[PDB]
């Protein structure tokens, strides 16, 4: 819809 | 898909931080409690959700 919309998901972040 | 790649539902918002653009992502099949900020380099395969978002922002810019 139309093509598959994907992305890397972040698991870390600034401490 | 690949290492930590998931399907996106929509893009909710954006911001810049340190000269770099990030987008707030709503993951498909997930709730607001899982939203993350993601750097552009993570959204190469989201051109369509990015347009829908950049679109809505023009619609009231």
């Amino acid at each position: 819809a139309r093509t598959k919309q994907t992305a890397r998901k972040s698991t870390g972040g600034k401490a | 898909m690949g290492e930590d790649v998931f399907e996106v539902e929509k893009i909710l918002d954006m911001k810049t931080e340190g000269g770099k653009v990030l987008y707030k992502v709503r993951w498909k099949g997930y709730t607001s409690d899982d939203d993350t900020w993601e750097p552009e380099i993570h959204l190469e395969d989201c051109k369509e959700v990015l347009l829908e978002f950049r679109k809505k922002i023009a619609e009231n810019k």
Side-chain angles (χ1 to χ4, degrees), chain A residues 1 3-15, chain B residues 1-2 4-43 45-46 48-61:
Chain A
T3 298
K4 314 312 125 71
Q5 300 300 305
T6 73
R8 208 162 293 262
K9 165 154 78 178
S10 293
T11 46
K14 68 173 170 63
Chain B
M1 266 180 155
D4 294 82
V5 175
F6 299 83
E7 171 173 358
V8 174
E9 191 193 321
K10 47 188 174 177
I11 304 299
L12 311 139
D13 262 319
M14 59 153 289
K15 81 182 176 191
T16 65
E17 183 146 315
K20 291 278 201 51
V21 179
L22 308 93
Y23 293 95
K24 186 155 141 177
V25 175
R26 167 62 47 65
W27 299 98
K28 182 134 177 77
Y30 286 85
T31 72
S32 82
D33 307 318
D34 288 288
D35 294 350
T36 57
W37 285 100
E38 296 300 340
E40 268 196 340
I41 66 172
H42 281 185
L43 313 166
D45 326 277
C46 278
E48 298 173 47
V49 286
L50 287 168
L51 270 55
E52 290 327 282
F53 174 78
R54 293 189 86 75
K55 191 140 62 64
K56 163 185 68 149
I57 299 297
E59 275 177 7
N60 23 258
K61 199 176 168 190

